[PDB]
C-alpha cells in the first residue's frame, strides 16, 4: 500500500482528464492510491506555500516555472528528478527544455509544455464590429473606439487581467527598446523613470481608448474568475491575451457558435524582439521529502509518457514536450495545425524571440504590486507619474527581497 497525494490547478476540463488519468493509473497499480488536490489558479500558490512552510506538501505537484526561485533557490526545494531516472523516462524531453527546470545541477520539474501569451479573439463579436484583428499596436489601440461606437459602451476588443496587462506592455517595451525588463545582476528593474512613465502612460491610453475594461469597471461585475464572467461568456469582452497552454479554459465558456480564434501578434516596425513571455507552461515535481520518490516518478511518467496517460491528458496542458507523447497526439489526430492552441504556439516561435524573461518578472509580489498600481490610476488616487515612481521604487524593493 502506497499512498500518494497529487496537487494541480486548472479549469474543469483539465480536472476531468487528470482524474480520468489517475483512475487508470490506479487500475494499472492496485497498490498505489493517489489522493487528488486540485483547484483553479486562484490561491493555489498561496496554499502550497503554506504547505511547503510546514513540510506537508504533496508527493507529486504541478508546479510553475517562476516558483523555482521561491521554493528552490539552491535546487533542493523539490526532489532531484535525476535520482528517479529509472522510473521516469527523461530522454523524452529536450535537454534545453530540461535546463529551464534545473537549478544547481538538480532537476526540479519536468516541463509539460512551453507557452507564450498571445492574442485570441472572439470571432463572433469581431464580425459584428466589422473589424479585422489588429496587426499593429495602433490598430489594437484604435479598435476600442470602433467597438464602443459600433457596438456600445459595454463591448471591448479584449479583457485584460492585471497580470495579462503587465506581460503585454512589457512586450511593447521590449519590441521598442530591446532590453530585459529586469537587470538580474543589479537586483532591480532595468527601465528608466521615463520608460516607467511610458509603461503606465500606455495602460492609461488603452484604458482611455476603451481597449479593455479599467480595473474599476471590471470590479463592478463581482469577483468571479474571468472566464466565468457574463461579458466574457456573452462575447462582450471579445478576446484575451493568454497562454496557449490553457486557452480552452476560456473558449469552453463562449456561447456557440462563437469561437476563440488566433489573432496576429502586434510587432513594431524595426523591432529586433517580439517581447514574448515564453517559458515552461508548467511542470511536474516530486516533494523534497516524499517517502515514495519511486512511486511518485512512476505517476509522473505515466501521465507524461505512457500511451494511456498521454491519451487521457490530451491537450489540457498544451502540446506535450515529451517526444513520444506529442507524436501520439499527432497520430491520433488530437494535434491539428489549425487548432488555435497549436497555431498560437507555432506562430509565436516564428516571431523573433531571443530575449528571455526572468522568473522575477513574474514574482507574485511584483504582479500584485502591478494590479495595485493600475488601480491607483483607475480610482483617481495616483497620477500616471506618481504611479510610475511608486511601481519603480516598491517593485525594486520586492526584487531585493525576491532575489535574496
Ligand X SMILES: O=C(O)C1=C[C@H](O)[C@@H](O)[C@@H](O[C@@H]2[C@H](O)[C@@H](O)[C@@H](O)O[C@@H]2C(=O)O)O1
Does 221 help bind ligand X (rule: CB under 6 A)?
Answer: no
- The secondary structure element, H or E, covering residue 51 is helix 44-53
Residue found by looking up cell 466589422 in the block: 130
Nearer to ligand X (CB atom), residue 79 or residue 277? 277
User: Is 285 among the residues that bind ligand X (CB under 6 A)?
Assistant: no
By C-beta, is 273 or 362 nearer to ligand X?
362
| 163 touching ligand X, by CB under 6 A | yes
Cβ contact 239:120 at 8 Å: yes
If binding is defined by CB under 6 A, does position 10 make contact with ligand X? Answer: yes
Nearer to ligand X, 41 or 221 (CB): 41
From 83-91, 144-152, 172-180, 241-249, give the range in contact with ligand X by CB under 6 A.
241-249
Query: Does 305 contact ligand X by CB under 6 A?
Result: no
Q: How far is CA 199 from CA 143, 213, 359, in A?
A: 20, 17, 20
Any contact of residue 361 with ligand X (CB under 6 A)?
no
Interface with ligand X, residue 243, by CB under 6 A: yes
Please state, in angstroms and rounded to a whole number, the distance separating the CA atoms of residues 1 and 29: 10
Of 263, 266, 233, 253, residue with least CA distance to 121: 263
Stretch that binds ligand X, among 51-59, 240-248, 300-308, 332-340 (CB under 6 A): 240-248
Beta carbon nearer to ligand X, 80 or 245: 245
Listed in sequence order, the residues at least 6 apart from 238 whose beta carbon sits closer than 8 Å to its beta carbon are 121, 122, 125, 126, 129, 147, 155, 156, 157, 158
Question: Total number of residues binding ligand X (CB under 6 A)?
Answer: 10
The residue (of 115 and 181) whose beta carbon lies closer to ligand X is 115
Cβ neighbours for 23, distance < 8 A, ≥ 6 positions apart: none
Candidate segments 16-24, 231-239, 243-251, 327-335, binder of ligand X by CB under 6 A: 243-251
Indicate which single residue of 15, 33, 39, 41 sits in contact with ligand X (rule: CB under 6 A).
41
- The residue at minimum Cβ distance from ligand X is 246
Full DSSP string of 300-332: HHHHHHSHHHHHHHTTBTBS--SHHHHHHHHHT
Rg, Å, the chain Cα set: 21
Site residues for ligand X per CB under 6 A: 10, 41, 64, 115, 163, 243, 245-246, 281-282
Amino acid at each position: 500500500e502506497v499512498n500518494l497525494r497529487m496537487s494541480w490547478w486548472g479549469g474543469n476540463g483539465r480536472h476531468q482528464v487528470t482524474l480520468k488519468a489517475l483512475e487508470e493509473f490506479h487500475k494499472q497499480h492496485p497498490n498505489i492510491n493517489v489522493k487528488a488536490e486540485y483547484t483553479g489558479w486562484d490561491g493555489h500558490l498561496s496554499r502550497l506555500t503554506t504547505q511547503i512552510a510546514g513540510g506537508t506538501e504533496p508527493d507529486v505537484m504541478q508546479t510553475n516555472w517562476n516558483w523555482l526561485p521561491i521554493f528552490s533557490k539552491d535546487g533542493t526545494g523539490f526532489y532531484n528528478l535525476f535520482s528517479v531516472k529509472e522510473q521516469l523516462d527523461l530522454a523524452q524531453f529536450d535537454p534545453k527544455e530540461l535546463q529551464q527546470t534545473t537549478v544547481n545541477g538538480k532537476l526540479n520539474g519536468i516541463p509539460i509544455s512551453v507557452t507564450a501569451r498571445i492574442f485570441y479573439f472572439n470571432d463572433a463579436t469581431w464580425a459584428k464590429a466589422g473589424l479585422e484583428y489588429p496587426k499593429t499596436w495602433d490598430e489594437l489601440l484604435a479598435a476600442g473606439k470602433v467597438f464602443k461606437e459600433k457596438l456600445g459602451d459595454q463591448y471591448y476588443p479584449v479583457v485584460l487581467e492585471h497580470q495579462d496587462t503587465l506581460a503585454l506592455i512589457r512586450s511593447y517595451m521590449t519590441q521598442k527598446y530591446n532590453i530585459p525588463t529586469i537587470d538580474e545582476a543589479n537586483k532591480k528593474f532595468a527601465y528608466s523613470p521615463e520608460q516607467w512613465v511610458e509603461f503606465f502612460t500606455m495602460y492609461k491610453t488603452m484604458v482611455d481608448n476603451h481597449v479593455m475594461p479599467s480595473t474599476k469597471y471590471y470590479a463592478s461585475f463581482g469577483k468571479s474568475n474571468m472566464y466565468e464572467m457574463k461579458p466574457w461568456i456573452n462575447g462582450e469582452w471579445a478576446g484575451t491575451y493568454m497562454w496557449n497552454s490553457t486557452i480552452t479554459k476560456y473558449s469552453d465558456n463562449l456561447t456557440k457558435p462563437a469561437k476563440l480564434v488566433l489573432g496576429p501578434y502586434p510587432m513594431l516596425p524595426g523591432a529586433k524582439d517580439a517581447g514574448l513571455f515564453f517559458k515552461p507552461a508548467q511542470m511536474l515535481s516530486i516533494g523534497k521529502s516524499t517517502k515514495h520518490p519511486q512511486e511518485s516518478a512512476m505517476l509522473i511518467n505515466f501521465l507524461l509518457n505512457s500511451k494511456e496517460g498521454v491519451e487521457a491528458l490530451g491537450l489540457e496542458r498544451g502540446v506535450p514536450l515529451s517526444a513520444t507523447a506529442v507524436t501520439q497526439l499527432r497520430a491520433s489526430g488530437v494535434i491539428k495545425d489549425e487548432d488555435p492552441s497549436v497555431a498560437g504556439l507555432n506562430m509565436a516561435l516564428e516571431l523573433p524571440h531571443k530575449m528571455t524573461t526572468s522568473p522575477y518578472f513574474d514574482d507574485p509580489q511584483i504582479v500584485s504590486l502591478f494590479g495595485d498600481a493600475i488601480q491607483y490610476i483607475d480610482y483617481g488616487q495616483k497620477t500616471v507619474q506618481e504611479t510610475a515612481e511608486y511601481f519603480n521604487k516598491q517593485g525594486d524593493r520586492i526584487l531585493k527581497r525576491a532575489m535574496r
